[PDB]
């Protein structure tokens, strides 16, 4: 009901609408849903900064633990002074609803 599940298998809650936050800037200074917390995702490989959509963070591929759908990435901060130190960037179209 606040629940966002893997679209492919519909078994797993991946996150909730409660966890949604926005790193995008609201002044003169979408497709990716960023959430503080998520569940039921397996991380693949190791963090990389190449082409990172969120400068300062590295990414690790995250897939649904049940059906292996590529749902998004775990983003991890490269510096200790950043907040959050970690979040999830989730492909909206890989989630239901
Ligand atoms: O922060 C991110 C997550 C990974 C994402 N990524 C991809 O989605 C992709 C597809 C094919 C070749 C290379 C990449 C790449 O780095 C990307 O470009 N930046
Ligand atoms: Zn799944």
Numbering used by the authors: 321 to 349, 360 to 427
Which text from the study accompanies this structure?
Thalidomide directly binds cereblon (CRBN), which was originally reported as a cerebral protein associated with mild mental retardation. CRBN is a highly conserved protein that forms a CRL4-type E3 ubiquitin ligase complex, CRL4CRBN, with Cul4A and damaged DNA binding protein 1 (DDB1), and plays a key role in limb outgrowth and expression of fibroblast growth factor Fgf8 in zebrafish and chicks. CRBN TBD consists of eight β-strands (β1-β8) with a single zinc ion, which is coordinated by four conserved cysteine residues from two CXXC motifs located in the β1-β2 and β5-β6 loops. The central β-sheet (β4-β5-β6-β7-β3) contains the tri-Trp pocket formed by Trp383 (β4-β5 loop), Trp389 (β5-strand) and Trp403 (β6-strand).
All of these relatively small but significant differences in the binding mode between (S)- and (R)-thalidomide molecules suggest that the (S)-thalidomide bound state of the thalidomide-CRBN complex is more stable than the (R)-thalidomide bound state. As with the previous structures, our structure of thalidomide-bound CRBN TBD prepared with racemic thalidomide revealed that the bound thalidomide molecules are all (S)-enantiomers. We found that the binding affinity of CRBN to the (S)-enantiomer was ~10-fold stronger than that to the (R)-enantiomer.
